[PDB]
Structure formats: structure tokens, C-alpha cells
Amino acid sequence: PTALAAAKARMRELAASYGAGLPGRDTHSLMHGLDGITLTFMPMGQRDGAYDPEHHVILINSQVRPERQRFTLAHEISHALLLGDDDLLSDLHDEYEGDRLEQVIETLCNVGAAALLMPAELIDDLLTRFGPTGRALAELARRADVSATSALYALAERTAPPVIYAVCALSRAKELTVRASSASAGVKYSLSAGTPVPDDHPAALALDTRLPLAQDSYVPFRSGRRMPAYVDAFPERQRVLVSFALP
């Protein structure tokens, strides 16, 4: 495939080895894989974290929320993994340079973080037990301790059937707003952020009543187009996680 795709595959492999060598993907456990590399939590203003290879240390901004710290850490770990791999690093140079190379490496580090926080096996186990549903999305976010959007993209990327995933919050039976969305492999239909969700829609229903719903419904495209699909909404603390199964 493309150079950026081969690099991603490789990054997913690096992250999987390091990950598979741990006792789970909890924070403290990710730290422990650090084979003689210092790790420090300290205030760093607006910067989230940094990796200093010469000093063999990873720095995490102690001022940000724990969710982003866990992420920033998976990210710097990826960064170290990438910089430790000479075949990968060289092929990148063969294809990029200057700021274009920095941005690509930043992108790979994000792909690596994800693979590390959300292993292919944990996602598949959830797809099996819960199906491609709001319920699964909700499980993955909690068990993985990552944001809804991280889970949204992880989940959709390993989904076989055509499905739309959405995270909704109160725009405030009250009307929601799509915050983030994502489609599986072959769906081209996208549900954009900003998209209002009607009160009568199962997603609004589930939230305002804190009751997992599931039933035949429609994708509420902001165009007015009402595409039928099976909907599974899993309501929680102020968000609702939804899947739209397209025939």
C-alpha cells in the first residue's frame, strides 16, 4: 500500500509488541514496560508532554486531566518506539523531511497511542459480546479509560457491517447535538458535528430517561433526509453513545 499506510501498520505492530509484553493496559502498567527510561510528572504550562531521547526521559504535564495524561503517555511511548526503530525511521526519511516529517511522526504517535490504549483483542471481545452498538462504544470507553472520540474511531475501524457511530450531548425529552461521529469501513454517509437530534428520536429518549434503548429508527441527517437504520443508544452521565446499523 501507500508509504503512510505501511508506516501505520508498522506502528500498530510496535505498539502491539510493547503492549503484549504488559499485564494489561492500565496506566501504571504502561509505565512499567519502560525499559530503563526515566518518567517524570511535572507542570509544563501548555505543553502536554515531551520525550527527550538524549536524557532517556519522558515528561508528562502534571497539570492536565488524567485522561489526557494517560493518552500523552501512550503517545510518548509510541514516539520512543518509533525513534528506536531504524527501518521505520529511515523509510520515513526516504519519503518525508522538514515539518512534513514532524507532522507525520506526530500522526504515527497518535496511531500508536490508540493501538496501545485499545488493543485489537479488547475491541473484538466487545464487538462479540455487545455487537457493533452504542453499548459496545460505551463499554470500550470505560474499560479502555479513553475519550468517547478515541473509542469512536477505534471501534468503527474494526467494525465489519456498515455502521455509523455517534456521540451526542445536550445542546442545552430535550434536543441533543452530535459532538463526534464515525463510520465503519465502507459507509460513505457521515453524521457531522453540530447535527441536531430530534426529541422523538431514540437517542434523545435514552438520555433524558437514562435507559438503554434499541429499536428500528432513522439516521437524523441535518439535511432532513431520514435514512432508516437500527439504532442502539447507550445513555450515560450527560452523553449518549449511538450506533446506526445501515441495511
CB atoms inside a 10 Å sphere around CB 59: 20
Closest by CA position to 239, among listed 154, 176, 194, 196? 176
Buried b (16+ CB within 10 A) or exposed e, 94-103: eebeeeeeee
CA distance 172 to 80: 42
Residue 202: how many other CB atoms lie within 10 Å: 22
Between CA 42 and CA 100 the distance in angstroms is 30
C-alpha cell recorded at residue 54: 538524549
Cell 523509510: give the residue.
91
First to last CA, the chain: 30
CB 8 within 8 A of CB 111: yes
d(C-alpha 137, C-alpha 139), whole Å: 6
Among this protein's residues, is 95 annotated catalytic?
no
Q: Give the whole-angstrom CA distance, residue 136 versus residue 141.
A: 9
Residues that constitute the known binding site for Zn(2+): 75, 79, 106
Please state, in angstroms and rounded to a whole number, the distance separating the CA atoms of residues 232 and 141: 16
Measured CA to CA in angstroms, residue 154 lies from 44, 85, 119, 208, 222 at distances of 29, 24, 9, 27, 25
3-class SS letters over 121-185:
HHHHHHHHHHCCCHHHHHHHHHHHCCCHHHHHHHHHHCCCCCEEEEEEEECCCCCEEEEEEEECC
Q: 180 is written with which cell numbers?
A: 463526534
| DSSP codes, the chain | --HHHHHHHHHHHHHHHHHHTSSSS-HHHHHHT-SS-EEEEE--TT--EEEETTTTEEEEETTS-HHHHHHHHHHHHHHHHHHH-HHHHHHHHHH--HHHHHHHHHHHHHHHHHHHHS-HHHHHHHHHHH-SSHHHHHHHHHHHT--HHHHHHHHHHT--S-EEEEEEEE-----EEEEEEEE-SS------TT-EE-TTSHHHHHHHHT--EEEEEEEE-TTS-EEEEEEEEEE-SSEEEEEEE--
Domains and CATH numbers, the chain: 1-117 (1.10.10.2910), 119-159 (1.10.10.1030), 160-247 (3.30.450.130)
Rounded to an integer, what distance in angstroms lies between the CA atom of residue 114 and that of residue 152?
Answer: 11
Decide the pairing of beta strands 57-61 and 38-42: parallel
Cβ atoms 38, 55 nearer than 8 A: yes
Of 13, 54, 67, 76, which is the active-site residue?
A: 76
What are the beta bridge partners of residue 239? 169
Are the C-beta atoms of residues 151 and 140 closer than 8 Å to each other? yes
Q: Are strands 163-170 and 176-183 parallel, antiparallel or unpaired?
A: antiparallel
Cα–Cα distance between 16 and 13 in angstroms, integer?
5
